[PDB]
Amino acid sequence: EXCNXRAIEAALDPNLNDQQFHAKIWXIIXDC
């Protein structure tokens, strides 16, 4: 759904890197 929201906005962050973004989304998968 707000979960898939979070996972997309995570993924669009240019200023991140693969492993940081990896962590960020696998919080939204850890939770949602």
Partner: protein, 95 residues
């Protein structure tokens, strides 16, 4: 706890199975962008026809659609949908 011959045969006999395929293999062309994930789950033909003169081919097939990140390095990254071919049926047929 040893698996019985009949179950091994049935489970390994020719059939559509989930298969993780690299997106670059479904799209050998282009390759300007980069894909996250680099691989996607797709139903494909797997198994054995248990015959010498038979190979396993898809008879019926459909189209699945997934949200993937297409990324041009230093040029930006956008999200979109892509369509892959899946196999709904497989059979053992001559060649």
């Amino acid at each position: 706890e040893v698996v019985k011959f009949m179950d091994v045969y049935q489970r390994s006999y020719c059939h559509p199975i989930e298969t993780l395929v690299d997106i670059f293999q479904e799209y050998p062309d282009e390759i300007e962008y980069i894909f996250k994930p680099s691989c996607v789950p797709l139903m494909r033909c797997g198994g054995c026809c248990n015959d010498e003169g038979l190979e396993c081919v898809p008879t019926e097939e459909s189209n699945i659609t997934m949200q993937i990140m297409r990324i041009k390095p230093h040029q930006g990254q956008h999200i979109g949908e892509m369509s892959f071919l899946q196999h709904n049926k497989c059979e053992c047929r001559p060649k």
